[PDB]
Ligand SMILES: Nc1nc2c(c(=O)[nH]1)N[C@@H](CNc1ccc(C(=O)N[C@@H](CCC(=O)N[C@@H](CCC(=O)N[C@@H](CCC(=O)O)C(=O)O)C(=O)O)C(=O)O)cc1)CN2
């Protein structure tokens with residue numbers, strides 16, 4: 001009777017309960033008791049949900065108030081000193097690392113401190129708070145905050161639910177972290193010896209509590225790892241394994257671990273886990289490594305995409321496994337945590353029933369693994385296979401999916417379609433001459449605060465409580481407000497705030513043929529911010545203009561130059577749920593050609609300064625050097641270039657990138673005139689050097705837009721002075737790290753006023 005396993009479940013709630021309480025707590029409208037109360041409530045719900053679904057192995061510690069990595073950075077006490085000298089409570093220290101904190105002296109005692117870096121969790125649009133280590137860091141097992149994975153195991157057990165804690169392992173933990181600036185000579189992985197005795201302690205604490213088996217994520221194995229890292233796995237797991245700890249199920253996902261087999265082919269663990277959705281072909285080789293005892297969790301229900309599973313194909317993999325290692329040592333599992341999927345599809349009432357029948361969100365995926373497991377167990381689930389098999393046939397055969405007019409148009413793509421009419425140095429002279437822009441020119445990145453008044457009115461529109469005529473009126477008020485202000489403040493190149501845009505990708509899925517999109521289809525991106533990425537189901541085209549009506553009005557009320565704003569083709573792909581049938585290369589290209597038509601429409605409609613965001617360009621990079629990556633590099637830029645290479649030289653193409661380990665050389669391939677690079681929040685020591693040679697114009701981001709912190713005019717100056725030491729002023733632009741949707745108005749005002757005030761000084765010194 002083959003068992004089922006889930007690697008992690010989405011904590012946000014079916015009604016984003018979690019967001020709502022977290023944001024309340026942050027704004028002083030809910031007590032700390034009330035936040036923790038609701039945490040419990042959700043934890044309880046989701047465990048019970050899975051229990052009822054029939055899942056055998058059920059995760060614990062997958063819950064988090066912000067990020068499960070940081071959660072460990074807390075537990076193990078990797079807490080930069082600067083966060084400690086304010087008598088904050090564990091929970092608030094946690095949040096402060098997250099989003100900084102700043103309150104003047106109230107009883108309440110005065111704090112001001114930044115936030116730690118945030119980066120892509122592998123090739124996903126989930127972002128973790130990056131561990132930050134230092135020579136001073138004393139790894140102890142913190143008990144002040146409680147001990148989370150213990151306490152949550154116990155909770156579950158007190159509802160009769162036996163769970164499998166999930167912990168990021170020492171090697172991944174370190175390798176993914178970073179040295180703090182007070183300690184540049186520090187490889188994070190060198191602390192392995194200091195940290196194990198902590199992981200060890202935790203583990204015994206868990207064993208005593210009742211923990212049979214523990215999932216311990218070591219996903220770094222899907223990456224290119226130098227030889228000196230690979231040898232540290234044995235050291236690590238040799239240390240931890242024992243009679244006083246639970247059995248450990250070394251867990252990998254998102255890619256291929258074969259290059260690292262030597263690393264792990266003689267470890268003491270109780271079993272492994274692998275992603276046979278992304279890399280089914282690795283099964284024979286990895287299964288080879290299993291010395292008796294050990295179990296193989298067979299990751300076969302996609303924790304990263306929402307296409308309904310093919311029960312035939314999936315069960316065939318699990319049986320290939322069963323052939324190699326015995327039915328009794330095999331487990332049907334999600335390929336990854338379902339963190340990256342929405343909660344429940346049944347919450348969606350406005351999708352074509354045909355299309356809906358093609359999908360499965362988290363709740364459904366629980367049934368999925370339950371059924372496949374049952375299948376291979378010899379049990380009758382005939383009725384579910386056929387229905388499932390129907391769902392597949394249908395998908396397979398659809399008039400929706402294909403659009404010949406597109407497929408042809410693809411063969412119009414060549415070098416010329418993706419080269420501008422002249423080189424940057426020649427376009428600058430034309431642009432300088434049109435725009436008359438001043439030295440140290442100031443601008444922002446697009447979005448301005450997404451005020452509940454905007455959210456409520458988009459919604460009243462969606463739901464017919466107001467006419468289109470009324471919505472246009474409302475949007476214009478708000479673009480007017482957003483301009484009038486930008487003018488007030490002194491900004492040079494303007495934007496329009498994106499008031500009319502739910503999300504920089506969803507606004508587009510709602511407008512392009514080939515898509516679907518959700519109402520309650522939300523996934524966490526970081527902290528309390530979530531998105532409901534759209535879904536690509538067919539061949540992509542743009543039948544109308546998407547953003548002209550708005551930007552033309554925008555341009556019409558200001559003499560100032562104004563940006564249009566799209567989302568480049570790679571980002572639309574990467575932050576959508578991609579197609580099952582086809583490659584992403586084919587999808588980007590379609591998007592490129594499709595986005596051209598908007599870009600062109602803009603130029604034609606008067607909007608001669610245009611920004612096309614491409615922030616996922618690094619995210620979307622394949623997890624391993626070789627054929628697939630070097631292809632990615634080439635088509636990924638090409639598609640971008642496709643949507644931008646028809647413009648006149650007098651037109652100013654802008655881009656933007658953020659919250660990623662950016663590769664300048666690839667960014668450069670886009671030959672954009674001007675870009676915005678997230679720099680402040682990420683405290684990257686090298687970004688300055690590594691972008692020493694960037695040939696086109698550039699604005700490294702001057703303040704962290706994900707903290708309510710207002711930076712001094714002084715903190716702007718410092719950063720600038722710092723950059724100017726490696727870069728000439730005739731290139732440098734001044735802007736924030738990213739957009740301002742999440743920000744409130746008070747701090748928007750004051751922080752830009754400072755930014756600009758500061759730019760204005762360097763203006764006059766030169
Ligand atoms: N997709 C994406 N990825 C990205 C970024 C980005 O902007 N987008 N930037 C970086 C960071 N990621 C981010 C992710 C989300 C948000 C964000 O601001 N999300 C908002 C809302 C976004 C949205 O979809 N807004 C809708 C939702 C409105 C709403 O909630 N309405 C209510 C009903 C009306 C009401 O009561 O308010 C409801 O549905 O229940 C809208 O404006 O229309 C949030 O969940 O806090 C920001 C950055 C990197 N990756």
Ligand SMILES: N[C@@H](CCS)C(=O)O
Pocket residue numbers: 445446447504565613615656658738739740741
């Ligand atoms: N233009 C987007 C960029 C987010 S990465 C915004 O300003 O919200």
Ligand SMILES: [Zn+2]
Pocket residue numbers: 615656657658659737738739
């Ligand atoms: Zn950004």
